[PDB]
Amino acid sequence: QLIAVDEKLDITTLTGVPEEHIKTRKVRIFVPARNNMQSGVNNTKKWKMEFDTRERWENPLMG
Amino acid sequence: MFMINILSLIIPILLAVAFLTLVERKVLGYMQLRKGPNVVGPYGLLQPIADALKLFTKEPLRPATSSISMFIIAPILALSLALTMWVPLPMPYPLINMNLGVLFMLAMSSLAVYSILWSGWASNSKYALIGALRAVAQTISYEVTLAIILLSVLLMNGSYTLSTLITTQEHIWMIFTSWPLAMMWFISTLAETNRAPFDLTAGPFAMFFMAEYANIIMMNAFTAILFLGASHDPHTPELYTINFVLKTLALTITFLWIRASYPRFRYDQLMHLLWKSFLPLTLALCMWHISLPIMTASIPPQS
Amino acid sequence: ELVQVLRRGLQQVSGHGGLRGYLRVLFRANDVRVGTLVGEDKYGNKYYEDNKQFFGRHRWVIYTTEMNGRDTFWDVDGSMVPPEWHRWLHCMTDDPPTTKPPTARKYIWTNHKFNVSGTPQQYVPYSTTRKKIQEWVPPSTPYK
Amino acid sequence: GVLRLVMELSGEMVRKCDPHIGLLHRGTEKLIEYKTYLQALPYFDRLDYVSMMCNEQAYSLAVEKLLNIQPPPRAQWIRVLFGEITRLLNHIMAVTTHALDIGAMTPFFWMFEEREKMFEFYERVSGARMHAAYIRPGGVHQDLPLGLLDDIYEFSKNFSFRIDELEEMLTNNRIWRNRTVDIGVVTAEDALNYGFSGVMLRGSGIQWDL
Amino acid sequence: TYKFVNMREPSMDMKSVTDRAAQTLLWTELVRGLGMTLSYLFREPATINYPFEKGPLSPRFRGEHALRRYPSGEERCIACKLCEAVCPAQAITIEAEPRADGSRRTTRYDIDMTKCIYCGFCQEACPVDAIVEGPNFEFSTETHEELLYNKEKLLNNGDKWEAEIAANIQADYLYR
Amino acid sequence: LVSDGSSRPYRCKIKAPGFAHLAGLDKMSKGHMLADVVAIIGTQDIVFGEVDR
Amino acid sequence: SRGEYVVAKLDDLVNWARRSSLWPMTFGLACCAVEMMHMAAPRYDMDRFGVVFRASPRQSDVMIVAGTLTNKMAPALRKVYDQMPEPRYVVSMGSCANGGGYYHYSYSVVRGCDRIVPVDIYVPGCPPTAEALLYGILQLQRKIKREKRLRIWYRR
Ligand SMILES: CCCCCCCCCCCCCCCCC[C@@H](O)O[C@H](CO[C@H](O)CCCCCCCCCCCCCCC)COP(=O)(O)OCC[N+](C)(C)C
Ligand SMILES: CCCCCCCC/C=C\CCCCCCCC(=O)O[C@H](COC(=O)CCCCCCC/C=C/CCCCCCCC)COP(=O)(O)OCCN
Numbered sequence A: 001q002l003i004a005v006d007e008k009l010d011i012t013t014l015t016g017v018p019e020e021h022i023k024t025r026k027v028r029i030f031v032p033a034r035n036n037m038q039s040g041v042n043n044t045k046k047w048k049m050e051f052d053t054r055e056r057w058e059n060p061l062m063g
Numbered sequence B: 001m002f003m004i005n006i007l008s009l010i011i012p013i014l015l016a017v018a019f020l021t022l023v024e025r026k027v028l029g030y031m032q033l034r035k036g037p038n039v040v041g042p043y044g045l046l047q048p049i050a051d052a053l054k055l056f057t058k059e060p061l062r063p064a065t066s067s068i069s070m071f072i073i074a075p076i077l078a079l080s081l082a083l084t085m086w087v088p089l090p091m092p093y094p095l096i097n098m099n100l101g102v103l104f105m106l107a108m109s110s111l112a113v114y115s116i117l118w119s120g121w122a123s124n125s126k127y128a129l130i131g132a133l134r135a136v137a138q139t140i141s142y143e144v145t146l147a148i149i150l151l152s153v154l155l156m157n158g159s160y161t162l163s164t165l166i167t168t169q170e171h172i173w174m175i176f177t178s179w180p181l182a183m184m185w186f187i188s189t190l191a192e193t194n195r196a197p198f199d200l201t202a203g204p205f206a207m208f209f210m211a212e213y214a215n216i217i218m219m220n221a222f223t224a225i226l227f228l229g230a231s232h233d234p235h236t237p238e239l240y241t242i243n244f245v246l247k248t249l250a251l252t253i254t255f256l257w258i259r260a261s262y263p264r265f266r267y268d269q270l271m272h273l274l275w276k277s278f279l280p281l282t283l284a285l286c287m288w289h290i291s292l293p294i295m296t297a298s299i300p301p302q303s
Numbered sequence C: 001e002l003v004q005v006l007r008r009g010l011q012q013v014s015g016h017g018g019l020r021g022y023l024r025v026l027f028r029a030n031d032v033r034v035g036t037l038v039g040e041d042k043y044g045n046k047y048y049e050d051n052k053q054f055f056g057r058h059r060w061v062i063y064t065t066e067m068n069g070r071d072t073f074w075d076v077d078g079s080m081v082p083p084e085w086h087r088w089l090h091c092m093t094d095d096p097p098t099t100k101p102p103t104a105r106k107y108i109w110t111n112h113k114f115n116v117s118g119t120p121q122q123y124v125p126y127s128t129t130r131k132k133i134q135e136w137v138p139p140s141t142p143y144k
Numbered sequence D: 001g002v003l004r005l006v007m008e009l010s011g012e013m014v015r016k017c018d019p020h021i022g023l024l025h026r027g028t029e030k031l032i033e034y035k036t037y038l039q040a041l042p043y044f045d046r047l048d049y050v051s052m053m054c055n056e057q058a059y060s061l062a063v064e065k066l067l068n069i070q071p072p073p074r075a076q077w078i079r080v081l082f083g084e085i086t087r088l089l090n091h092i093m094a095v096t097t098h099a100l101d102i103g104a105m106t107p108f109f110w111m112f113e114e115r116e117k118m119f120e121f122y123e124r125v126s127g128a129r130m131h132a133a134y135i136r137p138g139g140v141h142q143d144l145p146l147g148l149l150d151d152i153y154e155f156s157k158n159f160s161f162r163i164d165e166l167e168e169m170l171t172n173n174r175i176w177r178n179r180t181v182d183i184g185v186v187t188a189e190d191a192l193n194y195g196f197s198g199v200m201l202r203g204s205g206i207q208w209d210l
Numbered sequence E: 001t002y003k004f005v006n007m008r009e010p011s012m013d014m015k016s017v018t019d020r021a022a023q024t025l026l027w028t029e030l031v032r033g034l035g036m037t038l039s040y041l042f043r044e045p046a047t048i049n050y051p052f053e054k055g056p057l058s059p060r061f062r063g064e065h066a067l068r069r070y071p072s073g074e075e076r077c078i079a080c081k082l083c084e085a086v087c088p089a090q091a092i093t094i095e096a097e098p099r100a101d102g103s104r105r106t107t108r109y110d111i112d113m114t115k116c117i118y119c120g121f122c123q124e125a126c127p128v129d130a131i132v133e134g135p136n137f138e139f140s141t142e143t144h145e146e147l148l149y150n151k152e153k154l155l156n157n158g159d160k161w162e163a164e165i166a167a168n169i170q171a172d173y174l175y176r
Numbered sequence F: 001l002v003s004d005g006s007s008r009p010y011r012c013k014i015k016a017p018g019f020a021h022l023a024g025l026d027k028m029s030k031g032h033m034l035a036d037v038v039a040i041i042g043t044q045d046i047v048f049g050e051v052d053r
Numbered sequence G: 001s002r003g004e005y006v007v008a009k010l011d012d013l014v015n016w017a018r019r020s021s022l023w024p025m026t027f028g029l030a031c032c033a034v035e036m037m038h039m040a041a042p043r044y045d046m047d048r049f050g051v052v053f054r055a056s057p058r059q060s061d062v063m064i065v066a067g068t069l070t071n072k073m074a075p076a077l078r079k080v081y082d083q084m085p086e087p088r089y090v091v092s093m094g095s096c097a098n099g100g101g102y103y104h105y106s107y108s109v110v111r112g113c114d115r116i117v118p119v120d121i122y123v124p125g126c127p128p129t130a131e132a133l134l135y136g137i138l139q140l141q142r143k144i145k146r147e148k149r150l151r152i153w154y155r156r
């Protein structure tokens, strides 16, 4: 009723992410810095995971 | 000048069929708290011309896989039969005077289903074939009742001559002598032309539509002659033509009215309706009208 | 009775300036009704009312035959009504711009324009902002 | 709307029916997470677009409950009045479209005239004919116009005749009865277990109304 | 309280049976439906004569967008970006900078009318009545590109519809 | 509705009656003609905006 | 000469015939179909302009895309579009069909029906009032009136 298998978890093949969005990206885990424009500390309680910055360009129409 | 008479019969029927679409749209709209076409033309009078030109200018979609033979044969047959039905009728003088006019029109009505069958088979699709089979079955089933009721009514006429119906109804309409046969005749004509509540189903399509509407107008004219006979004065047939035209118009408007007023029947219900309510009553009334002229000693003359 | 309705039909024929005007209005608006003249537009539109009609049909407009640059004898559209008559005609108010005209502003258009889509006067979108990054310009003088 | 239906038929009878949905799925629930509550309000107008103010009311009731506030009495009265008007709109829609699919098609126009009048009420109260976004968690957004109540009374005093006209066409008709009687019968236990609600319950005799 | 809609028991006397049989055989209810339809034929249609007649509207109507300005002629928009922050469909793009006279004015104000849901939150979030949802609704377009308004198009719309916009705002501002 | 304490909803699941009614359509159309499926769908009062969401 | 005059008159006649009877097929995908049928209601009466109600796809002249076009639905719309006879015109109604509208940033929503089929007239609104869609139909009629097919054949 129990496999009791020993191996690290890997759900890469089930999430549907494209191949080039998995081994190429570089995630960052951090506690966001307090906005120096304010003295409140309520936004620096939890941990954030975010991806690396990629290219952004200007649309030929409407800019 | 026979060819002149032939053309003067054929062309006006086509024109009336052309304007019947406009009249039907206008009547349905004014029944549904709106209007029909009043922009294309002074009062929509140019609308059928616009429709005809647009249909004759649109591209045709040949299936590129079907048998072209039946594909082109079917509309020819449909329109030819629809135009051929008119000659037997007396208005008040038939173009062609025939002894068995009623039998001739029954035979043409019987032939009418071949266009449906050939159009269904030649379409190169299974679903269209299924629909064609349904339509053919309904048509033949209702034409049986049409034939029996027609014979029962004609038993009071004395012959199959369509002109004699003018003499029989000289003093009283046939509607008063046998109204139940008239109601079942009206419903059978409704079911024959695939008109609501029985409507379960560029160039050739327009021709098919023309044949259908011409058949509707012809059926209404036949009913008007058969059950509502006008008085004919041999020194002025204009009056009889006026009365017959007015009654035909009234019956056509009644068809449009029924289309605008009722829901649609299920296929089994239309089949059960016929085979379990019209046929037994039709047979009983046929027996009654066989027995009646002998019972009352009122046999019509001609034999 | 029937004589009364025929008389009203004849009055409708007579109130349109004769048979020529009757045919003109019949072929232009598909309507031959006669109503009280409310106002005349700067562009030539005429505005009529008839409070005896049911709501929706009690106010109407006969469009002009020649707007800014095009012949509108046959090609008429609802975008040819100026804003003040737009408010009066859409029942947003009970007062025509004749009794109480709108406030006058120096920036308000003096000439209303209809829908110019599919016309060389159509609107073409573009960016309204300057360039962000300025590039370095090499010198015109040689180095050696 | 748009529906894909795969069925197995033996002759005329329907042996198996399988509806495929998802042709109208825009993933609204995931879009809501990126919006604030006020920004997420207009989605419920689009959810059931025949009964808009009812969805607005449901969302508003949920949000206030979490908040722990309540609208003023006049807001509640306006909410209930426009909910009943919306129910009239939706029932006209259902009955008339059902008749049109069967083939009647005249009461469709007869009642869509009244639907247009109620759309005028919607537009007069909110400026939008259907996607009103009038009901908010706090209460109704702008308050009624001065002449609205009299017009609502005038409209509502002739609607019984309209329903009566519709009734003549379908209630006593034999074709309509043969089309609708003994079709789609569902038992009370099956309706309860299958998660049905509304008329789909009350048609089977279950006395339930929220 | 609850009602029964189909809890009637048909009468089983001879007269009632004969009446039901007469209804079946003579199509009395079908004749009644025909009569109702005939009566509905002979009453006035509700069709209006568009475009010569227009449907009723209200001062609260939401139509084409417009940017307004003060009676002196200066634009009301001060680049507060409240309309952009409250827009549910993210249809407004705003870019701003100090003007040549130091005033707080926009350099770019774009509305994508193919993204807008015409909810009116933009005009109710503006604190200076700059952006309004005007009364025009007959602005159909032959191409997708012309439905992307920039600041110049919206300012032109405001100058074109200022009279009606001012009248509607004067009518309805006491409800806001 | 699931709120995490912020100004944006953490979760918003929408329960529409059309979902359950269309689920029961399969059972309700057992042993009926093909033309009765239209009547059943009409009586279920189905709008697909709420069914699909 | 008379050569250009004859084709001018014939082109006018055929354009009038084509624009005087527009038979639409309507893709009632979403809530914009409600305003579509409200345009067919007695108040506006599309039919009095010659525009029939719910014509078949095989003999339809103009396609009206009224609602959101999803990824699961786009191939069906394209397939239906191909079947239609020429001359065929497409009318985009509502923001959802115009550019994605309220669901523009969605994985399952096509960002505009112009990605799938060419579109002649864009009707703005969420939803466009039945009067606005009537104005769009009349604008399409005027656009049809503007076209000159026999002239181009003569000058080519
Ligand atoms: C018997 C032989 C038949 C052969 C085939 C011919 C078909 C029958 C012939 C009859 C043709 C009918 C033409 C009549 C069309 C005129 C319509 C007129 O009323 O429209 C106006 C005139 O429009 C155009 O300027 C008229 C162009 C029509 C063509 C002119 C005459 C062409 C006849 C040439 C026939 C030769 C045929 C040769 C090949 C067989 C503009 O109205 P419109 O914009 O729409 O709608 C606006 C609605 N409003 C007013 C409420 C705002
Ligand atoms: C002593 C002398 C006696 C001589 C005879 C007198 C006795 C006659 C009494 C009865 C005769 C009248 C009966 C005629 C036919 C009736 C058949 C019938 O009843 O069919 C109906 C169905 O009939 C219809 O519904 C057909 C109508 C369908 C829609 C079409 C619209 C018809 C209404 C418009 C008016 C028609 C006007 C006709 C006049 C024609 C003028 C030329 C049965 O349907 P159900 O109620 O569902 O029952 C079966 C299931 N258990």
Ligand code: SF4
Pocket (backbone or CB within 6 Å): E083, E086, E087, E088, E089, E090, E091, E092, E111, E115, E116, E117, E118, E119, E120, E121, E122, E123, E133
């Ligand atoms: S009406 Fe609503 S969606 Fe449109 S621009 Fe204004 S806030 Fe944005």
Ligand code: SF4
Pocket (backbone or CB within 6 Å): E076, E077, E078, E079, E080, E081, E082, E083, E084, E094, E122, E125, E126, E127, E128, E129, E130, E131
């Ligand atoms: S239009 Fe109004 S809300 Fe939008 S940025 Fe300008 S001042 Fe602010």
Ligand code: SF4
Pocket (backbone or CB within 6 Å): D046, D049, D131, E117, G030, G031, G032, G067, G068, G093, G094, G095, G096, G097, G101, G102, G125, G126, G127, G128
């Ligand atoms: S376009 Fe607007 S009104 Fe139409 S379905 Fe989409 S959100 Fe609703």
